[PDB]
């Protein structure tokens, strides 16, 4: 543990943008669309759509852990705390060679296979006051979620019920205890954001996450259901996360696509409501894969040698 006090700001961490740009390049040579559409305007309103048609090799994109080590003249500083805002002065900082193995999982609403929170469930936000800034939740206990190209994912209704609780309790523990916590589905927007999208076996899954984000701080939802089953759907025509524009991938082919990921975190986003009565409504969020990265680099910061 380095004997000194430095400043950290995961929300302005540059490694995020360094990994992000990398993950994209890790996508341009692994998942190539049969066609990629992208805006192209000179500013004169009129916007032609630049189109690109390349080969569409069906490859079961299987993310590999990525280590980030500082070269020369550079050193990586890590922060150590059971609960770090990730945006302030760290006391138990410590220099490290490479950051922990991170599996660049690109997804929305749920953070899959990330890194759990040591102590308890921690939620970070560049500004909880601003109903526009995404709230990155960090789970201390992952919730296995099994998705299949067959058309759905199964989640433990038990585990997910607890999670929403040990999250709903951490929310008010930041917005006001005398405040009712509620969870509603996506407000609207792109399919990739409205549902819990992500890629499995190179297939872009789109799971309707309503049953996961329709929790009321009153009743339950385990009548005749042991496990939660999200009606997922694989799409060919999708909105690119790497950059504004659609992209069409070739249809599925492998006799079977399966995913067993750990819900290690979420990306929520409460609605302002113009300071209305105690009834904060949090809905799924995400879509800006950088937040994902952030949730993994929240406690890091590369710095120049001295």
């Amino acid at each position, epitope marked *: 543990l380095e004997n000194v006090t430095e400043n950290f700001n995961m929300w302005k961490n540059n490694m995020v943008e360094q990994m992000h740009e990398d993950i994209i390049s890790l996508w341009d040579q692994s998942l190539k669309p*049969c066609v990629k*559409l992208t805006p192209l305007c000179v500013g004169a309103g009129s916007c032609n759509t630049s*189109v690109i048609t390349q080969a569409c090799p069906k490859v079961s994109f299987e993310p590999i852990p990525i280590h980030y080590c500082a070269p020369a003249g550079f050193a990586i500083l890590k922060c150590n705390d059971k609960k770090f805002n990730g945006t302030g002065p760290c006391t138990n900082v410590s220099t490290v060679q490479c950051t922990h193995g991170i599996r660049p999982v690109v997804s929305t609403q749920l953070l899959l296979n990330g890194s759990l929170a040591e102590e308890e469930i921690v939620i970070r936000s560049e500004n909880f006051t601003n109903n526009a800034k995404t709230i990155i939740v960090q789970l201390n206990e992952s919730v296995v979620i099994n998705c299949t190209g067959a058309g759905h994912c199964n989640l433990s209704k038990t585990q997910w019920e607890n999670t929403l609780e040990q999250i709903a309790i951490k929310l008010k523990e930041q917005f006001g205890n005398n405040k009712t916590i509620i969870f509603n589905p996506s407000s609207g927007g792109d399919p990739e954001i409205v549902t819990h999208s992500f890629n499995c076996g190179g297939e872009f899954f789109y799971c309707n996450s309503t049953q996961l984000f329709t929790w009321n701080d009153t009743r339950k939802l385990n009548n005749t259901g042991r496990n939660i089953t999200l009606p997922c759907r694989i799409k060919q*025509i999708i909105n690119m996360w790497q950059e504004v524009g659609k992209a*069409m991938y070739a249809p599925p082919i492998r006799g079977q696509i399966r995913c067993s990921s750990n819900i290690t975190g979420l990306l929520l986003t409460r609605d302002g409501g113009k300071d209305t009565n105690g009834t904060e409504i949090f809905r799924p969020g995400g879509g800006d894969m950088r937040d994902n990265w952030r949730s993994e680099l929240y406690k890091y910061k590369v710095v120049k040698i001295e």
Partner: antibody
Framework: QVQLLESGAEVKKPGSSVKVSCKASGDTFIRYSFTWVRQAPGQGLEWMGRIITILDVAHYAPHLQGRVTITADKSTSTVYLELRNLRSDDTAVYFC?????????????????????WGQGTLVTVTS | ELELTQSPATLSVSPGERATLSCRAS??????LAWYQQKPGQAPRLLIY???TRATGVPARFSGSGSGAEFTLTISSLQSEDFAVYYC???????????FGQGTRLEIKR
């Protein structure tokens, strides 16, 4: 159950440009990808190109790239095939053809090459 | 640049008997092969596609087999209405550069 209707046979002259229409009806337009297949008298089918309607992207045949274009009007539900710099050999029966692609309006797309639904066919005579 | 050729330029056979068509192809086209049937003065007819699968609403006498660069649209007891030129379409490469066969006339032999 789509039914494809084509524009009338046209008699364009060498070096001109012809535009054949193809009205699609009986189902969801954007769920289909249309292809133009031309056939010269006595000759056989020749793939001219296909338009992934929904995406509004089209790809053409090598020996035609540059002088051919395929567009669709989702509004009126029509597909068009334009050939510029017409020649006598271009004289042929230009068939309009399409195939279902799946819930394309929902992101699903089979991107099929074969053609299930064909048009009545439009003849184009290019001569002096 | 696929050269899909249908060796049997012309096949003379009698009604009720069995007719066989072969579509030779350049590089492999996997299973992205279709078969068509064209009556004089009519738009083609999607018979088979994906190599071995008949199109919705088509006589079972038309059997489609093959995979790679050797496909066969074999027909059991032929039919009077089965007279027509048959075409094989390839739609495997991508970008889109589909090609048709040069054809095959299934004429009646008397």
């Amino acid at each position: 159950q789509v039914q494809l209707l084509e524009s009338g046979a046209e008699v364009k002259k060498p070096g001109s440009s012809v535009k054949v229409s193809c009205k699609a009806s009986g189902d969801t337009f954007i769920r289909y990808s249309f292809t133009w297949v031309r056939q010269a008298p006595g000759q056989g089918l020749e793939w001219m190109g296909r338009i992934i309607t929904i995406l509004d992207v089209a790809h053409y045949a090598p020996h035609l790239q540059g002088r051919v274009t395929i567009t669709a009007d989702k509004s009126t539900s029509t597909v068009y095939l334009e050939l510029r710099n017409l020649r006598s050999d271009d004289t042929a029966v230009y068939f309009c053809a399409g195939v279902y692609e799946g819930e394309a309006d929902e992101g699903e797309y089979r991107n099929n090459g074969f053609l299930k639904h064909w048009g009545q066919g439009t003849l184009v005579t290019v001569t002096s | 640049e696929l050269e899909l050729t249908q060796s049997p330029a012309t096949l003379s056979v009698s009604p009720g008997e069995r007719a066989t068509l072969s579509c030779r192809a350049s590089e492999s086209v996997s299973s992205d092969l279709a078969w068509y049937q064209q009556k004089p003065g009519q738009a083609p007819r999607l018979l088979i596609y994906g190599a071995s699968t008949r199109a919705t609403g088509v006589p079972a006498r038309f059997s489609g087999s093959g995979s790679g660069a050797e496909f066969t649209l074999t027909i059991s007891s032929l039919q009077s209405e089965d007279f027509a030129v048959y075409y094989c379409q390839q739609y495997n490469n991508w970008p889109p550069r589909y090609t048709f066969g040069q054809g095959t006339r299934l004429e009646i032999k008397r």
